[PDB]
Amino acid sequence: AFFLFCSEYRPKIKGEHPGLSIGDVAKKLGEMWNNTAADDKQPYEKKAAKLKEKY
DNA sequence: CGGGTTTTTGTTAAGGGCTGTATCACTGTGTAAGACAGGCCAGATC
Numbered sequence: 001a002f003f004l005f006c007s008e009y010r011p012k013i014k015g016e017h018p019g020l021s022i023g024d025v026a027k028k029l030g031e032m033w034n035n036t037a038a039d040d041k042q043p044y045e046k047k048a049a050k051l052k053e054k055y
Numbered sequence: 056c057g058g059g060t061t062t063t064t065g066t067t068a069a070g071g072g073c074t075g076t077a078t079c080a081c082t083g084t085g086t087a088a089g090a091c092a093g094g095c096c097a098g099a100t101c
Contacts, residue, residue, distance in 0.1 A: 007068035014069095022069040029068080048067080 002033035004044035009033070 006029040013025055033041060 003067050005068090010068060019070080022071065025070085026068070052066085 001038065001041035001045035001048075002030060004048040005033040005036075005041040006030055008044050 006026065009029050009032065010025070013019070013029060017025075019025055
């Protein structure tokens with residue numbers, strides 16, 4: 001569920017910060033998705049499951 | 056025959072670095088195509 005949350009927060013991260021490296025940005029997004037509650041990634045996980053079922 | 060427990064792969068998030076082909080202006084160069092100068096007539100004329 002954290003993968004779709006990271007994918008959805010990547011544009012927010014690029015808007016809040018200019019971005020220096022994709023690796024550090026991805027690490028920070030993963031750390032944030034792990035520190036936040038699991039309910040925050042529920043619609044993201046639902047959209048990921050929908051995209052997996054459609055493809 | 057069938058779940059439990061355990062042992063291995065995929066997934067997309069991304070701007071990068073790295074490596075493998077595909078292409079692009081360049082000409083040159085081999086090749087059938089189809090035209091053309093004769094060759095060989097059979098018919099018209101004095």
